Amino acid sequence: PAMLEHLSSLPTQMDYKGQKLAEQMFQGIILFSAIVGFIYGYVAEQFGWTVYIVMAGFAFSCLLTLPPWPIYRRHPLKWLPVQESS
Amino acid sequence: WDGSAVKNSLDDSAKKVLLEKYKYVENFGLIDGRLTICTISCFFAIVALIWDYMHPFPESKPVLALCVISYFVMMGILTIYTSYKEKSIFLVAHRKDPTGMDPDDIWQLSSSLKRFDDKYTLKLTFISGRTKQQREAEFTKSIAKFFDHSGTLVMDAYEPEISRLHDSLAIERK
Amino acid sequence: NTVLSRANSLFAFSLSVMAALTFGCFITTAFKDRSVPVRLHVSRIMLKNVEDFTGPRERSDLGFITFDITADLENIFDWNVKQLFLYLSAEYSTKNNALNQVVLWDKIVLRGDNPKLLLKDMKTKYFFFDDGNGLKGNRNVTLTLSWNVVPNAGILPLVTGSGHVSVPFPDTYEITKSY
Amino acid sequence: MNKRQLYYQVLNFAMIVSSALMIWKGLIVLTGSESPIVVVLSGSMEPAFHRGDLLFLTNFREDPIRAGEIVVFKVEGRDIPIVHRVIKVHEKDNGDIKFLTKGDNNEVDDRGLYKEGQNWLEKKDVVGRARGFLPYVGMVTIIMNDYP
Numbered sequence A: 001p002a003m004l005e006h007l008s009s010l011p012t013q014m015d016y017k018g019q020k021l022a023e024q025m026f027q028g029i030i031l032f033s034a035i036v037g038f039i040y041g042y043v044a045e046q047f048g049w050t051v052y053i054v055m056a057g058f059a060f061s062c063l064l065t066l067p068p069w070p071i072y073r074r075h076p077l078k079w080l081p082v083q084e085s086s
Numbered sequence B: 001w002d003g004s005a006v007k008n009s010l011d012d013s014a015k016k017v018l019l020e021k022y023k024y025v026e027n028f029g030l031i032d033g034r035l036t037i038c039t040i041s042c043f044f045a046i047v048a049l050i051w052d053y054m055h056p057f058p059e060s061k062p063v064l065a066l067c068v069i070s071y072f073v074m075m076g077i078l079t080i081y082t083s084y085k086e087k088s089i090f091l092v093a094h095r096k097d098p099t100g101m102d103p104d105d106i107w108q109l110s111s112s113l114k115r116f117d118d119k120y121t122l123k124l125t126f127i128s129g130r131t132k133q134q135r136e137a138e139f140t141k142s143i144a145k146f147f148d149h150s151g152t153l154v155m156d157a158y159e160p161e162i163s164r165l166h167d168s169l170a171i172e173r174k
Numbered sequence C: 001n002t003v004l005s006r007a008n009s010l011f012a013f014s015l016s017v018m019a020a021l022t023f024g025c026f027i028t029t030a031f032k033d034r035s036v037p038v039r040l041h042v043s044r045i046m047l048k049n050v051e052d053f054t055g056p057r058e059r060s061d062l063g064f065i066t067f068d069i070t071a072d073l074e075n076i077f078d079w080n081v082k083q084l085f086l087y088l089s090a091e092y093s094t095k096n097n098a099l100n101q102v103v104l105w106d107k108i109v110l111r112g113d114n115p116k117l118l119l120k121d122m123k124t125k126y127f128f129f130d131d132g133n134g135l136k137g138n139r140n141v142t143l144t145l146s147w148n149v150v151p152n153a154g155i156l157p158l159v160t161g162s163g164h165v166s167v168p169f170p171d172t173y174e175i176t177k178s179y
Numbered sequence D: 001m002n003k004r005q006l007y008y009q010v011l012n013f014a015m016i017v018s019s020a021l022m023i024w025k026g027l028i029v030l031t032g033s034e035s036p037i038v039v040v041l042s043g044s045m046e047p048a049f050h051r052g053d054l055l056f057l058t059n060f061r062e063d064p065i066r067a068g069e070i071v072v073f074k075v076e077g078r079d080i081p082i083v084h085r086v087i088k089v090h091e092k093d094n095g096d097i098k099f100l101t102k103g104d105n106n107e108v109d110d111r112g113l114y115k116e117g118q119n120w121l122e123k124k125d126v127v128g129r130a131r132g133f134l135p136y137v138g139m140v141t142i143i144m145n146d147y148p
């Protein structure tokens, strides 16, 4: 019947503006850390420690991005309208 | 799965509502032209592989370079033909009984769903060739009126919406 | 959104980090567009052990050269070149047009060991022997040092130094304490 | 069945195969020689090139190969491309140039084909002069070659 297509349709609902601003700030922080690492590799003239700073920034980005935050589920309770049930 | 899969299931549900309610005639041609371009490029690739496997390289350099240039030209033509018609157009269909007269009834569909957006855009196009008239229909809706809390996209409320849209297109037609 | 999709985005961002380090290496290789000169000073060269050996493939001759070196590597070292080779090209002349500048021996040099190398009266590591034996009857041999680089990830050229030393040579004589 | 899934699989297969073989054939045409993208599998050049390093080649480029360059030839007894470094050189004025080569962490000159009747190795077994290298991709190539 039509009830099989009725169930496997909806993915996890997202806060669109919060995720867009978070992605913009994410790319800004990663690019700024890359610029600071490039200035470190230009002035202090070390390559392996520059790669270590880039990997430390990557680990910081993973710790700030990978777990699902309560902030990232609190805003879909406000930005999204109330929808019906079965 | 993904919002692109939601758009694909939405277009499939629109085609299912069309097939259950009014039964118009499908078309092809753009996907067939893309497959024709890819078949010709695969012909260039198969000829290049066989001619390189049967002949050594310093006696087979220039025409193989010509095949590389031909692949560049065919992929550029594929990109230009993508930029021609593969921007938004999805469904092409003829309507009922185009017999006895000039070929009328060009029914054309295009969809629009931006990245991280709660709004959907559907543009319908009806082209009639007797009077040479195109009719556009821009339908900007919010997606939040159709979804539910944990994975039940209601079609029993989306089907009267498509019924009202087809009534609007019937007013535009007649 | 999916956590696997976020992991794929982080993998694409790691590919962007790879592209950024490739871009930084491209800036680095675009900064070293000029070739570096190395000053060479060779003063005393002795040619001895000139033995004519009837080789089965060609009438060959054995040679042995004692030389001197004086170089400078102040502005040569950077923070991206990995390892350095040392050649010593000896240019001779034959009857069959074998106008070859040819290497006596080689040296492996790793960074962190010595920023400036200088010594005296060191003999050759590899035995010099020529098959085409054009030195016998020649009064002209040319010595010039060259040295190779290897970067971290870039293209490796060869950089030849300065100083062409022209040394004569007698006809048939065995050992000579030259200058 | 629905043929559109079959045409989409042919589409994706066409994309990946045409892209990979186009990059391969375009590189080996624009170099000039046959130029295989080779991977170092020997630990002879270990202070210079470690195990699992990628090397991309260039043409001879209208230039007689003098001493101080690395050459890549093919060992027929194992059918393996092996890189060494040119030390000595010989010249003949008819288009014939002979050369001697050596590997690091070695003591004996490599015999190969000829031993004592002629020069040490042959000028026609070389593929070309090397141009550049990657230290990161070759380790991934060795990891992919761990499961052939």
Ligand SMILES: *[C@@H]1O[C@H](CO)[C@@H](O[C@@H]2O[C@H](CO)[C@@H](O[C@@H]3O[C@H](CO[C@H]4O[C@H](CO)[C@@H](O)[C@H](O)[C@@H]4O)[C@@H](O)[C@H](O[C@H]4O[C@H](CO)[C@@H](O)[C@H](O)[C@@H]4O)[C@@H]3O)[C@H](O)[C@H]2NC(C)=O)[C@H](O)[C@H]1NC(C)=O
Residues within 6 Å of the ligand: C091, C140, C141, C142, C162, C164, C166, C167
């Ligand atoms: C022994 O026999 C030789 C050959 O007849 C005499 O000539 C000298 O040869 C040496 C090497 O063969 C020269 O040194 C270097 O030669 C390089 C190759 O040049 C060739 O082509 C030129 C013609 O264009 C010939 O004259 C030359 O002999 C070679 O066959 C040059 O590239 C070198 O140039 C240097 O300076 C330029 C700047 O001008 C730099 O850009 C280069 O990088 C490089 O540093 C260099 O010239 C030597 O110049 C020849 N002449 C002299 C006077 O030495 C020898 O004279 C002879 N010896 C004796 C004692 O008789």
